[PDB]
Amino acid sequence: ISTIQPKANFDAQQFAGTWLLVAVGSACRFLQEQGHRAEATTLHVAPQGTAMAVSTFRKLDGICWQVRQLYGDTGVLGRFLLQARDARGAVHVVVAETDYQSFAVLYLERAGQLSVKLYARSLPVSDSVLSGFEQRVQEAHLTEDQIFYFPKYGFCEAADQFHVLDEV
Amino acid sequence: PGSQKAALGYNILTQEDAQSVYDASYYGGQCETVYNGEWRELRYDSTCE
């Protein structure tokens, strides 16, 4: 395990805005166990100094939900920490790779438990990008059997006042 | 949580709680437990989805 290199000169202002989650690679059981109902997710992203706010949007049983989180910077460009809010333990984050207008591959890790997630500005992703993601997975020592996709449709926006987790 | 108020004495003349009458914390060595029907609290795990 190591902190891999981020996007060179990561521009939070360009990486800002709307991302759709496309696929996740992880050894996390709950993507393979109960891997059905991988409900679609999207981020709104804003810079907030060097930290970034993120609003994940999701459905849950058809109720649209918003989770707002601060990705605190590590003091290092493109490197962030999520807090141990519920004693979950802090999650290290690296913006490994992005075309700010097109695609991103984000590295996230806690307690050596590692995930990589591929987001896009777009419904399609270039198959070359997807292939890069596959090799990113292999380099992370994750199997193809630990890659999981998310549906093309049914993204949500603007969850209700009562359906915002607002963990911060 | 909030069991201590039931332990307090009550002043009918003022409708104010007094000092504790019951021991709010003595268990008599029993482990007798109550199911909290509202235990469900959402969590999110960004390391998964």
From Swiss-Prot, chain A:
- Give UniProt keywords alphabetically: Complement alternate pathway, Complement pathway, Cytolysis, Disulfide bond, Immunity, Innate immunity, Membrane, Membrane attack complex, Pyrrolidone carboxylic acid, Retinol-binding, Secreted, Signal, Target cell membrane, Target membrane
Disulfide bonding pattern of the chain:
64-156
Regulation of its function = Membrane attack complex (MAC) assembly is inhibited by CD59, thereby protecting self-cells from damage during complement activation. MAC assembly is also inhibited by clusterin (CLU) chaperones that inhibit polymerization of C9.
Subcellular compartments: Secreted; Target cell membrane
Give me any GO biological process, just one: complement activation, classical pathway
Tell me a Gene Ontology molecular-function term this record carries: retinol binding
Predominant cellular place of this UniProt entry's protein: secreted
Q: Name one GO cellular component term.
A: extracellular exosome
Organism superkingdom: Eukaryota
| Similarity comment | Belongs to the calycin superfamily. Lipocalin family.
Q: What does this protein do?
A: Component of the membrane attack complex (MAC), a multiprotein complex activated by the complement cascade, which inserts into a target cell membrane and forms a pore, leading to target cell membrane rupture and cell lysis. The MAC is initiated by proteolytic cleavage of C5 into complement C5b in response to the classical, alternative, lectin and GZMK complement pathways. The complement pathways consist in a cascade of proteins that leads to phagocytosis and breakdown of pathogens and signaling that strengthens the adaptive immune system.
Q: How does it assemble?
A: Heterotrimer of 3 chains: alpha (C8A), beta (C8B) and gamma (C8G); the alpha and gamma chains are disulfide bonded. Component of the membrane attack complex (MAC), composed of complement C5b, C6, C7, C8A, C8B, C8G and multiple copies of the pore-forming subunit C9.
**Protein's name according to its UniProt entry:** Complement component C8 gamma chain
What is the covered span of the full protein?
33 to 200 of 202
Swiss-Prot record, chain B:
Q: Which domain of life is it from?
A: Eukaryota
Query: Where found?
Result: Secreted; Target cell membrane
Report the family membership. Answer: Belongs to the complement C6/C7/C8/C9 family.
Quote the subunit structure annotation: Heterotrimer of 3 chains: alpha (C8A), beta (C8B) and gamma (C8G); the alpha and gamma chains are disulfide bonded. Component of the membrane attack complex (MAC), composed of complement C5b, C6, C7, C8A, C8B, C8G and multiple copies of the pore-forming subunit C9.
Function, in words: Component of the membrane attack complex (MAC), a multiprotein complex activated by the complement cascade, which inserts into a target cell membrane and forms a pore, leading to target cell membrane rupture and cell lysis. The MAC is initiated by proteolytic cleavage of C5 into complement C5b in response to the classical, alternative, lectin and GZMK complement pathways. The complement pathways consist in a cascade of proteins that leads to phagocytosis and breakdown of pathogens and signaling that strengthens the adaptive immune system.
Disease per record is:
Complement component 8 deficiency, 1: A rare defect of the complement classical pathway associated with susceptibility to severe recurrent infections, predominantly by Neisseria gonorrhoeae or Neisseria meningitidis.
Query: Mind telling me what this protein is named?
Result: Complement component C8 alpha chain
Question: Which gene is the coding source of this polypeptide chain?
Answer: C8A
